[PDB]
Structure 1
Amino acid sequence: ADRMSKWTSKRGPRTFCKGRGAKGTGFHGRDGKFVQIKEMIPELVVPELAGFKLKPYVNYRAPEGTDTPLTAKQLFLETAAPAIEKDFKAGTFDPEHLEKYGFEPTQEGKLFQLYPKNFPR
Structure 2
Amino acid sequence: GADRMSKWTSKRGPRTFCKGRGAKGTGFHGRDGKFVQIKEMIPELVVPELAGFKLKPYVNYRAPEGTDTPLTAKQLFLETAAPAIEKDFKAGTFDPEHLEKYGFEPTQEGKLFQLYPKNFPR
TM range (shorter): over 0.9
Residue-pair matches, total: 121
C-alpha deviation, 1:3, in angstroms: 1.0
- Cα distance in 2, alignment partners of residues 80 and 90 from structure 1: 15
C-alpha deviation, 1:67, in angstroms: 1.1
Q: Per-residue CA shift, 1:94-113, capped at 9, x if unaligned?
A: 00000000000010000000
C-alpha deviation, 1:51, in angstroms: 1.1
Query: Structure 1 length normalisation: TM-score?
Result: 0.99
Q: Per-residue CA shift, 1:64-96, capped at 9, x if unaligned?
A: 001100000000000000000100000100000
Query: Structure 2 length normalisation: TM-score?
Result: 0.98
C-alpha deviation, 1:119, in angstroms: 0.4
Q: Any unmatched runs of 5+ in structure 2?
A: none
Q: Per-residue CA shift, 1:17-47, capped at 9, x if unaligned?
A: 1000011101001000110000000000011
Identity of paired residues, percent? 100
What is the RMSD of the two structures over their aligned residues, measured on CA atoms? Answer: 0.5
Partner residue, 2:114: 113
- Which contiguous aligned blocks of 4+ residues in structure 1 show a shift greater than 4 angstroms? none
Q: Any unmatched runs of 5+ in structure 1?
A: none
